[PDB]
Write a protein that binds this ligand. Structure first.
Ligand code: ZN
Ligand code: ZN
Lengths: 323, 136, 263, 283, 189, 276
RNA sequence: GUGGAAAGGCGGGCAGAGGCGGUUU
């Protein structure tokens, strides 16, 4: 069973590897227009030079990179807002914005890793071939591999170090997700984040179909091979091949509604009270990335916080709900 | 020695700035010999490592040299020169030190016979990137 | 199958130094006893204090799979396993150096063959390698097959002191023994075939067309640069004497290790 | 014993990347994890090793899920038990995944006579000791079309640099990664050639090859397809049986199945007896 | 232990004057493994095969001393037929095929009684200095007996050689060539 | 008995990358001096014979009348009983594999496989009529080697476990796809009756070679050889004694292996059929 | 009146398993 369409309830943005300096951008009206340089430079080359690159290599004063093309005379993504600004762009395969599947698979794992450490137990998972674990992790912790030990005792355990997390033991390789359909030019828009940076994102009111599918044939082969604390918690119920999906969408619901209740602890407060609740990247805070909601913790985080909390246009920065 | 600079690389950018400014003083295409071309490339990448520039930030420019390299080899240059300028715009800082070596080479290349001078330009630009990773 | 064949060089000159027939009686009988009597103790691991440390691929067994076919006054044809034919080639020469006073030496040709090859053809190839190692400098071993340039400055066969110096330099960095690579160089089986693909750029055209920075690139992207620093930068000491580069002589040390860590 | 030739069924079409694929190999500047490319043209292809090997893989798990059902159709499937020979390091201890290659166990029949009865090893071949049953299919390397080669001439992007990040859960520090990926939508001319060795059971092999394709349209094709990098699609251009006489007289009278705008599931489920009714008349 | 000499050094050796050997040989004898496959169950069973491979401009020549009318009618039409079939060996794999050209070469040889043979000879009397080449052959699938020839470079004193006729039980007589090809030489004392 | 030599000259194109191998871990066969790869005459003749023996194995009943030596053979191999020639088509055992080789001159004179490819036999022999010359690179594909381009490439294939996804890599040196070689086949016209059937059978096996592979992995998609015919010359019996150009030349510039038999054998060869 | 005649270096083998370009002030 597939075609698990998503709706957006908030501005949502995927960071990408690019940013847009104001040489590419000039809003002639309130609609911010994104032009391409290759059609602007080469068509001006028939009308004439190193003076075009000298203003480009300067990056000074922008306003002067606009009037030359306005008088004596393009199209692109045309992402409207609805200077000295740096728009963090969204991911586009051909100028068409889509949601990457590797981003949606990661938001599920932080919920599933929370439920596995909540049901615990762990001494039976390390009872074999080791050569409720949060309370020992504070003494264990006393560009980083801090989840290299916690996820190895929860997802995939292989035998220098006692546990080193070979990927072959992982029950997450049966869950396949695929990249969603492209959203469209009209549902991509530029917004301003006010931290209690200009970014283009997806406004609420869009619908694209991400196609989540579960491979049952791998768990039948790997019934003996998996060494996860996830696996013990998911085989103990019984019917692990048919119980994995059941465990999947209940970790999606019980984690992010527990984060939503802690977040409530005016106009944004009405958004919290008013499908499957899921929270994606760049918008979720460290707590919604982290088992720090379960987390001793202040002594660990002082050496390794609820200070900053971003928001754009009266709304939090990610809430996407599936079926 | 090529291996001796790695012992010293691991204010030090100023001592190699005379080596980069001397190489930027000579801008004629094929003005150095085959052994002298690679000896310039050791001084470039050692200068580009003290004020270090990552290969990614350069990676769009390295793409346009390579897609043309299949099109030159039995298959234009201003498209690379337009990208080599615009990538140097969004610095921050050491992108100007990499622009002072491309743009003298690309201004001469801008009008040049295509089959020979670009294939000789492509050997120097490999050794800059190639030797840049050998030091870091 | 490893097949070694060698002889003692300038031996007819040495027997012509004798004044009396009692000196010919002594010179031809001590010479014969090294190959008749004392070459069997070299195979049995004896005399290792005098020999020291030779280029080996494994610890020397108590019963080596070595078959001595023929071993005359100054000749010796020996077949067996290739990794122990290789070590016996250096163990015999280092002990032949101690038996004489350094005045007489050994040319040795080595070969590596398919098993189900006719023995007239194994003998024909190593006889063509023993005189290839003899007309050049005559105190030199022919370890492995080699592609070379035709410029006349490049000789296929290593001097004896040269190849043991390249083994003390290059081999303990990349190799641990018994068909196992050095620690943190596991899963680099494809890495060491790249360095011999770089080395074949030198064979098509010398005088540094491309090989100097490509070595620095492949050592660069893997994070290991202590591996072979003499290959990345051109040797001015090599250019001033018109001798080959240090990337040319590393064929004989890599290709022996690639066959030993095949599986 | 008694190898005979009746002709070849040739399947031509266009593999399409509905989501961008990645096959990859272990240039100087470039993405850390690049994609395999043609050494003469620089365009990223799809190898025949990667397409045959994924079809043989997906068809072997399709047998172990139904060893109760496939056993009555084919002999020598009662020679073993379901599972792998991974715990007991033995080349034939009675499991389906019997032969190890270097460290991993793949189902390979050990004898010529047991490979002529297995559905996996008739179509794909065996190579036992003293045995060597050769394959009945050829899966060519799949290059770009004549259309998508012109897109590389005009400057449109064939590849892409996808950037991914693994986030440390506790400290929220990010480790970035870059992976080369063919742009989604690109198409590839593939070719699959079945040798009609026995007119008795050519019909079972065509249904078993097309069963494995529809499994591969459900799963991915190479390189991290649990994240989206598969979603591949077979589009059938032509379907053609070249009879033995074809190679004698050279005339272009060799019988053809239209297969136009039809899926891999349409060729088996909707019209297998209607389309192949004319192949059976010549055989 | 050298085997060949070029024309500058071959003339100096006939007059016992000093000379040098060539440094490179223009060919290599190469061991190419082949295979035999079962048609049904493709079992590989290899065997080893020897071939002479030449350089980019190297090759093979042979000499002819005789009247032009015999060369124009017999030897010159034979070498165009033998260019398309083989010149001994596995000619079904393209071995022995070649293109023929014709030249003229001059050798400055001293005048004496003793002369070297540039061919196998089957001598009629005892030679002076020689090397025994013992070869047989194969004639239409019939094995020829091993005959004691003389090698190339062996020294005779007024010996024509002699052409041997072997019955061999074949439709026609088989003649084995065996004749001298003398160039004068100066022997030592 | 001799009448002439039909010579076929063409270009062999590697549409997919080719492997033959000599034993980068699996190196392809090369020249000993220059280092360039080629295609041996043994590999091309041995594949054309193997493809055509399976063609004749399937048609032993229908070709008894045209080829009277095929009445003695039943389809199959003599491998299930370790015994020489008795009834089965694959009768001769060389070392460990079974091959059709006719045992006499008079039997191989009327076999479609052995009148063309030859027979060893005992107490008599049958030599070949074709010569399959080695195929080196073209002169056009040789300066790419001189300019510095790669003529061989390294294909790294892996082996995946089905339960654990354990990967086990290996390497295979492979001649680059696209590369063009030049072949030549010289057919010795020994009998003026047998030559039309021998050229059709040689072109049939060349048409089976374009849909099968040539050497190497092949089932994994390596071989994929295409034949382009530059020219066909006849070189009659009178050419060899006088040397003047009596060479009947059949012209084929873009003709396929199928188009040379797509009714073209009867038409284009109207002059060789004339002068016999 | 050729040290010849006959003989595919080949069969089987997914570059793959894991990873929210977003943290934080
Ligand atoms: Zn099977
Ligand atoms: Zn026959």
């Amino acid at each position: 069973m597939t075609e698990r369409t998503l709706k957006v309830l908030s501005p949502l943005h995927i960071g990408t590897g690019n940013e847009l300096t104001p040489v590419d951008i000039y809003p002639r009206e309130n609609i911010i227009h994104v032009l391409d340089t290759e059609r602007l430079v080469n068509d001006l080359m028939n009308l004439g030079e190193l003076n075009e690159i000298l203003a480009l290599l300067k990056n000074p004063p922008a306003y002067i990179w606009k009037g030359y093309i306005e008088e004596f005379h393009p199209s692109d993504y045309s992402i409207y807002t609805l200077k000295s600004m740096q728009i963090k762009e969204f991911i586009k395969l051909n100028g068409r914005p889509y949601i990457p599947g590797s981003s949606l698979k990661g938001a599920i794992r932080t919920a599933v890793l929370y439920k596995a450490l909540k049901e615990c137990r762990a001494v039976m998972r390390v009872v074999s071939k080791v050569n409720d674990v949060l309370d020992y992790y504070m003494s264990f912790l006393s560009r980083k591999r801090a989840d290299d030990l916690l996820e190895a005792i929860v997802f995939g355990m292989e035998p220098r170090s006692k546990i080193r997390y070979e990927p072959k033991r992982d029950p997450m390789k049966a869950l396949i997700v695929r990249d969603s359909k492209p959203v469209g030019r009209k549902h991509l828009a530029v917004y301003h984040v006010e931290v209690i940076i200009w970014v283009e994102a997806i406004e609420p009111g869009a619908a694209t179909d991400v196609e989540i599918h579960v491979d049952t044939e791998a768990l039948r082969l790997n019934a003996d091979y998996f060494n996860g604390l996830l696996w013990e918690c998911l085989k103990e119920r019984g019917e692990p091949g048919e119980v994995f999906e059941d465990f999947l969408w209940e970790a999606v619901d019980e984690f992010y509604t527990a984060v939503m209740k802690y977040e409530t602890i005016s106009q944004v407060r009405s958004f919290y009270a008013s499908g499957h609740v899921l929270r994606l990247g760049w918008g979720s805070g460290w707590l919604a990335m982290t088992i720090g909601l379960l987390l001793k913790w202040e002594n660990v985080r002082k050496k390794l916080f609820p200070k900053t909390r971003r928001l754009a246009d009266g709304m939090p920065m990610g809430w996407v709900v599936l079926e | 020695v090529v291996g001796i600079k790695k012992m010293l690389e691991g204010q030090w950018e100023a001592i190699q700035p005379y080596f980069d400014n001397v190489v930027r003083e000579a801008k004629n295409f094929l003005e150095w010999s085959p052994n002298k071309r690679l000896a310039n490339a050791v001084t470039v990448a050692a200068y580009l490592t003290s004020q270090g520039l990552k290969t990614n930030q350069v990676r769009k420019i390295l793409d346009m040299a390579r897609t043309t390299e299949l099109k030159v080899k039995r298959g234009k240059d201003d498209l690379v020169k337009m990208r080599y300028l615009l990538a140097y715009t969004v610095g921050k800082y050491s992108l100007d030190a990499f622009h002072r070596i491309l743009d003298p080479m690309l201004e001469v290349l801008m009008g040049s016979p295509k089959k020979e001078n670009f294939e000789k330009f492509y050997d120097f630009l490999q050794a800059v990137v190639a030797y840049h990773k050998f030091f870091g | 199958l490893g097949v070694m064949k060698g002889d003692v060089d300038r031996l007819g000159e040495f027997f012509s130094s004798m004044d009396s027939p009692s000196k010919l009686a002594t010179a031809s009988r001590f010479m014969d006893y090294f190959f008749k009597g004392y070459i069997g103790a070299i195979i049995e691991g004896k005399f290792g204090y005098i020999i020291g440390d030779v280029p080996s691929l494994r610890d020397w067994p108590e019963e080596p799979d070595i078959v001595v076919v023929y071993a005359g006054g100054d000749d010796f044809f020996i077949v067996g396993a290739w990794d122990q034919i290789f070590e016996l080639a250096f163990r015999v020469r280092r002990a032949f150096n101690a038996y004489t006073g350094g005045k007489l030496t050994l040319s040795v040709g080595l070969g590596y063959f398919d098993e189900r090859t006719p023995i007239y053809r194994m003998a024909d190839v190593v006889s063509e390698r023993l005189d290839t190692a003899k007309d050049e400098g005559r105190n030199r071993v022919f370890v492995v097959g080699r592609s070379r340039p035709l410029d006349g400055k490049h000789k296929l066969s290593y001097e004896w002191n040269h190849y043991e110096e390249l083994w003390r330099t290059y081999a303990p960095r990349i190799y641990a023994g018994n068909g196992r690579l050095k620690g943190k160089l596991e899963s680099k089986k494809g890495l060491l075939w790249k360095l011999l693909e770089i080395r074949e750029l030198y064979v098509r055209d010398p005088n540094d067309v491309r090989w100097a920075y490509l070595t620095a690139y492949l050592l660069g992207r893997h994070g290991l640069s202590d591996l072979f620093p003499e290959l990345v930068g051109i040797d001015t000491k090599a250019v001033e004497r018109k001798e080959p580069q240090p990337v040319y002589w590393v064929d004989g040390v890599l290709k022996i290790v690639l066959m030993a860590v095949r599986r | 014993m008694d190898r005979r030739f009746y002709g070849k069924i040739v399947i031509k079409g266009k593999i399409k990347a509905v989501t961008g694929l990645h096959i990859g190999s272990q240039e100087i500047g470039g993405i850390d994890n690049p994609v395999i490319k043609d050494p003469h043209t620089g365009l990223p292809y799809i190898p025949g090793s990667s397409l045959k090997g994924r079809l043989r893989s997906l068809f072997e798990i399709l047998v172990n899920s139904r060893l109760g059902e496939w056993r009555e159709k084919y002999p020598s499937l009662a020679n073993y038990s379901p599972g792998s020979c991974r715990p007991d390091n033995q080349e034939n201890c009675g499991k389906f995944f019997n032969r190890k290659i270097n460290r991993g166990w793949i189902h390979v029949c050990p004898d010529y006579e047991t490979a002529l009865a297995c559905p996996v090893c008739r179509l794909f071949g065996a190579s036992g000791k003293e045995s060597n049953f050769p394959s009945r299919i050829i899966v060519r390397d799949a290059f770009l079309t004549k259309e998508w080669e012109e897109k590389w001439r005009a400057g449109e992007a064939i590849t892409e640099a996808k950037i991914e990040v693994g986030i440390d859960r506790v400290t929220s520090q990010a480790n970035p990664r870059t992976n080369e990926r063919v742009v989604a939508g690109a198409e590839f001319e593939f070719e699959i050639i079945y040798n009609v060795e026995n007119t008795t059971h050519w019909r079972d092999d065509i249904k078993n090859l097309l069963t494995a394709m529809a499994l591969l349209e459900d799963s991915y094709l190479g390189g991290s397809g649990s994240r989206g990098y598969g979603k591949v699609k077979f589009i059938f251009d032509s379907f053609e049986f070249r009879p033995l006489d074809y190679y004698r007289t050279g005339k272009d009278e060799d019988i053809v199945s239209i297969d136009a705008r039809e899926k891999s599931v349409s060729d088996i489920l909707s019209g297998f007896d209607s389309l192949f009714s004319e192949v059976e008349g010549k055989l | 232990k050298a085997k060949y000499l070029d024309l500058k050094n071959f003339e100096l050796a006939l007059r016992l004057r000093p000379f040098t050997i060539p440094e490179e040989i223009p060919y290599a004898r190469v061991d190419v493994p082949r295979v035999v496959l079962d048609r049904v169950t493709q079992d590989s069973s290899i065997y080893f095969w020897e071939e002479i491979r030449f350089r980019e401009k190297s090759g093979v020549y042979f000499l002819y001393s005789g009247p032009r009318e015999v060369f124009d009618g017999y030897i010159a039409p034979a070498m165009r037929f033998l260019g398309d079939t083989g010149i001994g060996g596995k000619s079904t794999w393209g071995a022995g095929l070649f293109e023929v050209e014709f030249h003229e070469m001059k050798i400055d040889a001293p005048g004496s009684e003793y002369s070297v043979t540039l061919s196998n000879a089957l001598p009629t009397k005892t030679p002076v200095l020689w090397r025994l080449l013992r070869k047989g052959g194969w004639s239409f699938g019939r094995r020829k007996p091993r005959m004691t020839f003389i090698a190339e470079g062996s020294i005779v004193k007024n010996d024509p050689g002699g052409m041997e006729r072997l019955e061999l039980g074949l439709s026609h007589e088989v003649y084995v060539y065996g004749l001298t090809f003398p160039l004068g030489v100066e022997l030592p004392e």
